[PDB]
Design a protein around this ligand. Sequence first.
Ligand SMILES: CC(C)c1ccccc1-c1ccc(C[NH3+])cc1Cl
Length: 325
Amino acid sequence: GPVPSRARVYTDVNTHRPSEYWDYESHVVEWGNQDDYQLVRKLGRGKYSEVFEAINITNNEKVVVKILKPVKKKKIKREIKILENLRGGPNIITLADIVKDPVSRTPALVFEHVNNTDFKQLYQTLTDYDIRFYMYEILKALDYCHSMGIMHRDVKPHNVMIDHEHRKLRLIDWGLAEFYHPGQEYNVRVASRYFKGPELLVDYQMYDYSLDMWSLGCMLASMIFRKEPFFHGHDNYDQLVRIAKVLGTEDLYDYIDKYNIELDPRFNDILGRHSRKRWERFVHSENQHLVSPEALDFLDKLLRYDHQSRLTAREAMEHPYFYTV
Ligand SMILES: CC(C)c1ccccc1-c1ccc(C[NH3+])cc1Cl
Protein backbone atom coordinates (compact mmCIF):
# COMPACT_ATOMS: atom_id res chain seq x y z
CA GLY A 1 0.00 0.00 0.00
CA PRO A 2 1.02 3.71 -0.13
CA VAL A 3 3.67 4.96 2.39
CA PRO A 4 2.06 7.09 5.21
CA SER A 5 3.02 10.82 5.61
CA ARG A 6 2.76 13.41 8.45
CA ALA A 7 2.84 17.25 8.29
CA ARG A 8 6.32 18.66 9.21
CA VAL A 9 4.63 21.40 11.33
CA TYR A 10 1.41 21.68 13.46
CA THR A 11 1.09 17.83 13.26
CA ASP A 12 -0.88 17.26 16.50
CA VAL A 13 -2.62 20.67 17.01
CA ASN A 14 -6.09 19.06 16.64
CA THR A 15 -5.16 15.89 18.64
CA HIS A 16 -4.34 18.08 21.68
CA ARG A 17 -7.66 20.07 21.47
CA PRO A 18 -11.13 19.00 22.64
CA SER A 19 -13.52 17.42 20.10
CA GLU A 20 -15.71 20.63 20.18
CA TYR A 21 -12.95 22.50 18.20
CA TRP A 22 -12.77 20.11 15.19
CA ASP A 23 -16.05 18.07 15.41
CA TYR A 24 -18.01 20.31 13.02
CA GLU A 25 -20.93 17.86 12.72
CA SER A 26 -21.76 18.52 16.43
CA HIS A 27 -21.59 22.34 15.94
CA VAL A 28 -24.87 24.11 16.70
CA VAL A 29 -25.64 26.75 14.07
CA GLU A 30 -27.73 29.76 15.25
CA TRP A 31 -29.37 32.14 12.70
CA GLY A 32 -29.19 35.92 12.78
CA ASN A 33 -31.98 38.09 11.43
CA GLN A 34 -32.12 38.06 7.60
CA ASP A 35 -34.27 41.24 7.96
CA ASP A 36 -31.13 43.08 9.21
CA TYR A 37 -29.83 42.91 5.60
CA GLN A 38 -30.99 44.66 2.45
CA LEU A 39 -29.52 43.25 -0.82
CA VAL A 40 -27.96 45.94 -3.10
CA ARG A 41 -26.56 44.15 -6.21
CA LYS A 42 -25.11 40.83 -7.43
CA LEU A 43 -21.29 40.63 -7.22
CA GLY A 44 -20.58 37.10 -8.41
CA ARG A 45 -21.76 33.50 -8.78
CA GLY A 46 -19.73 30.51 -7.57
CA LYS A 47 -20.11 26.71 -8.01
CA TYR A 48 -22.82 26.34 -5.29
CA SER A 49 -23.24 30.02 -4.24
CA GLU A 50 -24.62 33.46 -5.33
CA VAL A 51 -22.88 36.55 -3.92
CA PHE A 52 -24.52 39.90 -3.16
CA GLU A 53 -23.40 43.30 -1.92
CA ALA A 54 -25.73 44.23 0.93
CA ILE A 55 -26.14 46.70 3.72
CA ASN A 56 -26.71 45.98 7.41
CA ILE A 57 -29.78 48.26 8.01
CA THR A 58 -29.12 48.25 11.81
CA ASN A 59 -25.75 50.13 11.45
CA ASN A 60 -25.54 51.23 7.73
CA GLU A 61 -22.49 48.91 7.20
CA LYS A 62 -21.79 47.44 3.75
CA VAL A 63 -21.47 43.61 3.89
CA VAL A 64 -21.30 40.67 1.44
CA VAL A 65 -24.01 37.93 1.55
CA LYS A 66 -23.01 34.46 0.18
CA ILE A 67 -26.32 32.62 -0.52
CA LEU A 68 -25.58 28.85 -0.30
CA LYS A 69 -27.39 26.17 -2.33
CA PRO A 70 -27.91 23.67 0.63
CA VAL A 71 -26.71 20.63 -1.41
CA LYS A 72 -24.75 19.18 1.58
CA LYS A 73 -25.59 20.18 5.22
CA LYS A 74 -22.30 18.66 6.60
CA LYS A 75 -20.26 20.89 4.20
CA ILE A 76 -22.11 24.06 5.40
CA LYS A 77 -21.42 23.07 9.07
CA ARG A 78 -17.76 22.53 8.19
CA GLU A 79 -17.37 26.03 6.53
CA ILE A 80 -19.18 27.77 9.43
CA LYS A 81 -17.11 26.03 12.18
CA ILE A 82 -13.85 26.82 10.37
CA LEU A 83 -14.85 30.48 9.81
CA GLU A 84 -15.81 30.66 13.52
CA ASN A 85 -12.47 29.10 14.62
CA LEU A 86 -10.44 31.44 12.39
CA ARG A 87 -12.48 34.61 13.05
CA GLY A 88 -10.06 37.46 13.81
CA GLY A 89 -7.02 35.70 12.33
CA PRO A 90 -4.57 37.89 10.31
CA ASN A 91 -5.98 38.41 6.75
CA ILE A 92 -8.79 35.84 7.31
CA ILE A 93 -12.17 37.04 5.99
CA THR A 94 -14.50 37.88 8.92
CA LEU A 95 -17.78 35.95 9.11
CA ALA A 96 -20.12 38.62 10.56
CA ASP A 97 -23.38 36.63 10.64
CA ILE A 98 -25.24 33.51 9.41
CA VAL A 99 -28.86 33.90 8.22
CA LYS A 100 -31.71 31.96 6.59
CA ASP A 101 -34.40 32.61 3.93
CA PRO A 102 -37.58 31.27 5.68
CA VAL A 103 -39.66 30.74 2.50
CA SER A 104 -37.14 28.72 0.36
CA ARG A 105 -35.09 27.47 3.44
CA THR A 106 -31.75 28.89 2.14
CA PRO A 107 -28.72 29.46 4.39
CA ALA A 108 -26.55 32.54 3.81
CA LEU A 109 -23.18 33.60 5.24
CA VAL A 110 -22.60 37.30 5.86
CA PHE A 111 -19.02 38.64 5.53
CA GLU A 112 -17.23 41.92 5.86
CA HIS A 113 -17.10 43.71 2.51
CA VAL A 114 -13.76 43.98 0.65
CA ASN A 115 -13.45 46.43 -2.27
CA ASN A 116 -11.76 43.87 -4.59
CA THR A 117 -9.86 44.34 -7.92
CA ASP A 118 -9.27 41.29 -10.28
CA PHE A 119 -5.74 39.85 -11.09
CA LYS A 120 -5.73 41.04 -14.80
CA GLN A 121 -6.66 44.65 -13.75
CA LEU A 122 -4.24 44.63 -10.74
CA TYR A 123 -1.04 43.36 -12.56
CA GLN A 124 -0.30 46.68 -14.43
CA THR A 125 0.05 48.77 -11.21
CA LEU A 126 1.84 45.99 -9.20
CA THR A 127 5.54 46.60 -8.43
CA ASP A 128 8.12 44.00 -7.23
CA TYR A 129 7.74 45.26 -3.58
CA ASP A 130 3.88 44.94 -3.88
CA ILE A 131 4.13 41.24 -4.85
CA ARG A 132 6.48 40.61 -1.87
CA PHE A 133 4.08 42.59 0.41
CA TYR A 134 0.89 40.70 -0.62
CA MET A 135 2.61 37.32 -0.76
CA TYR A 136 3.64 37.91 2.90
CA GLU A 137 0.01 38.84 3.79
CA ILE A 138 -1.18 35.50 2.32
CA LEU A 139 1.57 33.69 4.29
CA LYS A 140 0.41 35.31 7.60
CA ALA A 141 -3.13 33.94 6.84
CA LEU A 142 -1.79 30.44 5.94
CA ASP A 143 0.60 30.19 8.87
CA TYR A 144 -2.35 31.24 11.06
CA CYS A 145 -4.88 28.72 9.67
CA HIS A 146 -2.22 25.91 9.56
CA SER A 147 -1.31 26.73 13.25
CA MET A 148 -5.10 26.30 13.92
CA GLY A 149 -5.01 22.78 12.35
CA ILE A 150 -6.83 23.86 9.18
CA MET A 151 -5.87 23.30 5.54
CA HIS A 152 -7.51 25.87 3.16
CA ARG A 153 -7.35 23.48 0.12
CA ASP A 154 -8.58 26.12 -2.41
CA VAL A 155 -5.78 28.72 -2.56
CA LYS A 156 -6.08 30.72 -5.82
CA PRO A 157 -6.37 34.39 -6.99
CA HIS A 158 -10.23 34.28 -7.02
CA ASN A 159 -10.09 33.29 -3.30
CA VAL A 160 -7.82 36.25 -2.34
CA MET A 161 -9.59 39.61 -2.06
CA ILE A 162 -7.35 42.70 -2.40
CA ASP A 163 -8.29 46.36 -1.70
CA HIS A 164 -5.10 47.87 -3.15
CA GLU A 165 -6.06 51.46 -2.08
CA HIS A 166 -5.99 50.34 1.58
CA ARG A 167 -3.31 47.63 0.96
CA LYS A 168 -5.82 45.17 2.53
CA LEU A 169 -5.83 41.42 1.73
CA ARG A 170 -8.35 38.75 2.81
CA LEU A 171 -8.28 34.96 2.28
CA ILE A 172 -11.88 33.92 1.40
CA ASP A 173 -14.03 30.87 0.41
CA TRP A 174 -13.38 28.34 3.17
CA GLY A 175 -15.97 25.91 1.75
CA LEU A 176 -13.31 23.32 0.85
CA ALA A 177 -11.21 23.86 4.03
CA GLU A 178 -10.65 20.87 6.35
CA PHE A 179 -9.13 20.04 9.74
CA TYR A 180 -5.75 18.28 9.68
CA HIS A 181 -5.51 14.99 11.65
CA PRO A 182 -2.21 12.99 11.34
CA GLY A 183 -2.74 9.71 9.41
CA GLN A 184 -6.11 10.81 7.95
CA GLU A 185 -6.78 9.99 4.26
CA TYR A 186 -8.54 12.92 2.57
CA ASN A 187 -10.63 13.30 -0.61
CA VAL A 188 -8.27 14.35 -3.45
CA ARG A 189 -11.12 16.10 -5.36
CA VAL A 190 -10.31 19.49 -3.73
CA ALA A 191 -8.66 22.74 -4.99
CA SER A 192 -9.14 24.15 -8.50
CA ARG A 193 -7.46 22.29 -11.44
CA TYR A 194 -4.59 24.78 -12.10
CA PHE A 195 -3.66 24.88 -8.39
CA LYS A 196 -4.08 21.17 -7.52
CA GLY A 197 -0.84 19.79 -6.01
CA PRO A 198 0.90 16.61 -7.35
CA GLU A 199 -0.46 14.55 -4.38
CA LEU A 200 -4.07 15.29 -5.55
CA LEU A 201 -3.22 14.43 -9.22
CA VAL A 202 -1.52 11.05 -8.37
CA ASP A 203 -4.36 10.29 -5.84
CA TYR A 204 -2.19 10.43 -2.66
CA GLN A 205 -4.86 10.75 0.12
CA MET A 206 -2.62 11.40 3.20
CA TYR A 207 -1.74 15.06 2.32
CA ASP A 208 -1.49 18.09 4.65
CA TYR A 209 -1.02 21.89 4.90
CA SER A 210 1.82 21.68 2.27
CA LEU A 211 -0.95 21.35 -0.42
CA ASP A 212 -1.66 25.09 0.17
CA MET A 213 2.03 25.91 -0.29
CA TRP A 214 1.95 24.30 -3.78
CA SER A 215 -1.13 26.42 -4.72
CA LEU A 216 0.67 29.52 -3.41
CA GLY A 217 3.69 28.57 -5.63
CA CYS A 218 1.33 28.32 -8.68
CA MET A 219 0.06 31.85 -7.87
CA LEU A 220 3.61 33.29 -7.49
CA ALA A 221 4.73 31.66 -10.82
CA SER A 222 1.73 33.21 -12.74
CA MET A 223 2.54 36.68 -11.31
CA ILE A 224 6.38 36.86 -11.69
CA PHE A 225 6.15 35.29 -15.25
CA ARG A 226 2.73 36.88 -16.25
CA LYS A 227 1.49 33.48 -17.46
CA GLU A 228 -2.03 32.87 -16.07
CA PRO A 229 -2.53 30.11 -15.11
CA PHE A 230 1.09 28.89 -14.90
CA PHE A 231 0.24 25.14 -15.27
CA HIS A 232 -2.64 25.12 -17.79
CA GLY A 233 -4.18 21.66 -17.65
CA HIS A 234 -7.36 20.81 -19.65
CA ASP A 235 -8.33 17.92 -17.25
CA ASN A 236 -6.83 16.48 -13.99
CA TYR A 237 -4.55 14.00 -15.85
CA ASP A 238 -3.32 16.68 -18.28
CA GLN A 239 -2.64 18.94 -15.25
CA LEU A 240 0.15 16.61 -14.05
CA VAL A 241 1.63 16.52 -17.60
CA ARG A 242 1.80 20.38 -17.61
CA ILE A 243 3.68 20.25 -14.22
CA ALA A 244 6.03 17.49 -15.57
CA LYS A 245 6.83 19.72 -18.65
CA VAL A 246 8.41 22.24 -16.16
CA LEU A 247 9.61 20.22 -13.14
CA GLY A 248 10.74 17.38 -15.40
CA THR A 249 9.66 13.71 -15.24
CA GLU A 250 12.73 12.42 -13.25
CA ASP A 251 11.72 14.09 -9.92
CA LEU A 252 8.09 13.01 -10.54
CA TYR A 253 9.04 9.32 -10.72
CA ASP A 254 11.31 9.68 -7.65
CA TYR A 255 8.28 11.16 -5.77
CA ILE A 256 5.88 8.28 -6.66
CA ASP A 257 8.60 5.69 -5.79
CA LYS A 258 9.32 7.38 -2.39
CA TYR A 259 5.61 7.17 -1.34
CA ASN A 260 4.94 3.84 -3.18
CA ILE A 261 2.14 5.55 -5.17
CA GLU A 262 0.32 3.41 -7.79
CA LEU A 263 0.34 5.79 -10.83
CA ASP A 264 -2.86 5.47 -12.92
CA PRO A 265 -2.28 3.58 -16.27
CA ARG A 266 -3.55 6.59 -18.35
CA PHE A 267 -0.31 8.47 -17.46
CA ASN A 268 1.92 6.06 -19.57
CA ASP A 269 -0.03 7.29 -22.68
CA ILE A 270 0.28 11.10 -21.94
CA LEU A 271 3.18 11.73 -19.47
CA GLY A 272 6.19 11.01 -21.70
CA ARG A 273 9.75 12.20 -20.84
CA HIS A 274 10.59 15.80 -19.89
CA SER A 275 13.79 17.58 -18.74
CA ARG A 276 13.80 19.68 -15.54
CA LYS A 277 13.55 23.31 -16.75
CA ARG A 278 15.61 26.24 -15.34
CA TRP A 279 13.20 28.88 -13.87
CA GLU A 280 15.16 31.65 -15.79
CA ARG A 281 13.72 30.13 -19.07
CA PHE A 282 10.32 31.78 -18.26
CA VAL A 283 11.83 35.32 -17.94
CA HIS A 284 10.95 37.69 -20.83
CA SER A 285 10.83 41.48 -21.43
CA GLU A 286 7.16 41.73 -20.31
CA ASN A 287 7.71 39.95 -16.93
CA GLN A 288 11.39 40.65 -15.96
CA HIS A 289 10.43 43.62 -13.62
CA LEU A 290 8.94 41.16 -11.04
CA VAL A 291 11.80 38.57 -11.38
CA SER A 292 14.93 38.47 -9.14
CA PRO A 293 17.28 35.60 -8.02
CA GLU A 294 15.46 35.67 -4.59
CA ALA A 295 12.02 35.33 -6.33
CA LEU A 296 13.17 32.32 -8.41
CA ASP A 297 14.88 30.64 -5.40
CA PHE A 298 11.65 31.12 -3.35
CA LEU A 299 9.47 29.70 -6.19
CA ASP A 300 11.85 26.70 -6.55
CA LYS A 301 11.35 25.83 -2.83
CA LEU A 302 7.49 26.11 -3.07
CA LEU A 303 7.07 24.19 -6.39
CA ARG A 304 8.43 20.71 -5.41
CA TYR A 305 6.71 17.35 -6.18
CA ASP A 306 7.49 16.07 -2.66
CA HIS A 307 4.96 17.75 -0.35
CA GLN A 308 7.36 17.23 2.54
CA SER A 309 10.25 19.06 0.83
CA ARG A 310 8.09 22.19 0.22
CA LEU A 311 8.70 25.19 2.54
CA THR A 312 6.16 25.60 5.39
CA ALA A 313 4.31 28.95 5.68
CA ARG A 314 6.60 29.94 8.63
CA GLU A 315 9.73 28.84 6.65
CA ALA A 316 8.49 30.83 3.59
CA MET A 317 8.15 33.94 5.80
CA GLU A 318 11.91 33.71 6.64
CA HIS A 319 12.96 33.59 2.93
CA PRO A 320 15.27 36.43 1.66
CA TYR A 321 12.51 37.31 -0.87
CA PHE A 322 10.72 39.00 2.11
CA TYR A 323 13.72 40.87 3.66
CA THR A 324 12.30 44.12 2.15
CA VAL A 325 8.87 43.71 3.89
C1 LIG B 1 -0.24 39.95 -5.42
C2 LIG B 1 -1.11 38.72 -5.18
C3 LIG B 1 -0.84 38.09 -3.82
C4 LIG B 1 -1.02 37.70 -6.31
C5 LIG B 1 0.14 36.94 -6.47
C6 LIG B 1 0.19 35.95 -7.43
C7 LIG B 1 -0.90 35.71 -8.25
C8 LIG B 1 -2.05 36.46 -8.11
C9 LIG B 1 -2.14 37.46 -7.13
C10 LIG B 1 -3.47 38.11 -6.90
C11 LIG B 1 -4.39 37.45 -6.09
C12 LIG B 1 -5.67 37.95 -5.92
C13 LIG B 1 -6.07 39.13 -6.53
C14 LIG B 1 -7.46 39.70 -6.35
N1 LIG B 1 -8.54 38.73 -6.50
C15 LIG B 1 -5.15 39.81 -7.33
C16 LIG B 1 -3.87 39.32 -7.49
CL1 LIG B 1 -2.75 40.33 -8.36
